[model samples]
Target: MQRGIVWVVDDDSSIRWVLERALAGAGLTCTTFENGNEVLAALASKTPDVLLSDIRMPGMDGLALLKQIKQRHPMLPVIIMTAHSDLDAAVSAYQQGAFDYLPKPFDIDEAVALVERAISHYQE
Candidate 1:
């Protein structure tokens, strides 16, 4: 199976930077977006193997983005990122079709491992 692409969508540039580096270190290509709209626009032409998006954003938050992706790219895996206290919203995202949820301030290794696992699942 081909190695998968990972897309990280977050308003914080630092978050994107960190995730980009982590994903790249894991032998995966990654793209970053400041908001869901930008990601949605890119989705028209590119299909990411995995999506890692922040739960809150100025527009079309993670849940909405998941809904849109689920409709257009159901097979792609999506991972919702949130604070530990935001378990309720995380659960909601899962119910709405998120493949996984990670709490904020997460270890880069954990995130990379999760993305790797997701790609493997997709390949299966």
Candidate 2:
């Protein structure tokens, strides 16, 4: 099967733009959201192959969002991103069922690779 869509959520517009461009360059389709609320709303209609979400946001934090998503979509892969990279946050993300954790200021190629890996795993 062909590669699937990726949904990227970040309160920062720059991060969204960067992710969108990188994913597209890596031959993946991407959709972006500014906050968890928008992502939750989108989830009701469609499910992306992978979700890349920022940990800190105005409304629902990524950890809470991850819990909600896991409750309803356990099999979906979520990659958590955080500028405030701390052991506790990373541990929480993994415990909550994130596919991976991405500390911010991440390399674009590394981000693309993670998304590609997630997609490949899902396809399998």
Candidate 3:
């Protein structure tokens, strides 16, 4: 299977920085964003094969962003990110449309595998 392009949006700067570096180690090419709004703007020029986003942001939270992405490009798959404390909310949104959710403090192996799984599903 081909490795996919992925975009990540999060409110936390540290989180964005971390994922940018971490994802590369998995042989996944990724772009990181500060919030959902910027990710949408970037979507205008380039569409990612898969996306991972944070649930609670200052502007345009993940669920709301997920809806718009679905509207513009329904084939795109989204992976939701949430703090462990927000599992209930994340699960609720995941049920709505998100492809999957990753709880914080997660191992890289899990994150890499999940993204790869979504990429495979998207290509299918």
Candidate 4:
């Protein structure tokens, strides 16, 4: 089975670009979003296999974006990443029906692992 395509949304351009290139090098196709604004719009263009979108609580609405995804793609998994490490965010997101949650200073491999975890479902 093939690991599927991925989408990344980060308020930081460099981090988004880095993740895009890094994940691509690791052999996963990626699309990067600098803002949460166009994410839903892009969702119409292409369906995402998995999503790793990290943003601050106040910096941008990670919660809001997650809601949109849930409403649109209930089957898709979305990993929530916060700007600060807060257990509350983790708990809240789980209750919000998020696939998983993480904090800042995120390691690339871990996110890659989350994608791998979903590969079987997306595998063709």
Best by lDDT: 1
> Could you report the Cα RMSD, in angstroms, for every candidate shown?
2.0, 2.0, 2.4, 2.6
lDDT string, candidate 1, 19-95, tens digits: 89997666787798887877887877768788888756855656776778878888878788877545686686566
lDDT per residue as tens, model 2, 1-124: 3367788888788889888998767667779887787787787776777788866575565776677877888887777777574436667556776676777878988888887787778565
State model 1's lDDT: 0.78
TM-score of each: 0.86, 0.86, 0.81, 0.81
In candidate 3, stretches whose alpha carbon ends up further than 4 angstroms from where it belongs are 122-124
Q: Go through the candidates in order and give each one's C-alpha lDDT.
A: 0.78, 0.76, 0.73, 0.71
Cα shift from native, residue 124, model 2 (Å): 5.0
Check candidate 4 and list the clashing pairs: none
**Residue-wise C-alpha lDDT for candidate 3, range 33-114, written one tens digit per residue:** 7768778888887677778776657556567777787778777777777775566776775566667677765776677778
Model 4 over residues 11-112: C-alpha lDDT tens digits? 787767756776777777788877676777887886777877776436556767777788788888777776565557668665666665656567877767
Query: Candidate 2: global Cα-lDDT?
Result: 0.76
TM-score of 1: 0.86
Model 1 poorest ten-residue lDDT run: 84-93
How does model 2 score by TM-score? 0.86
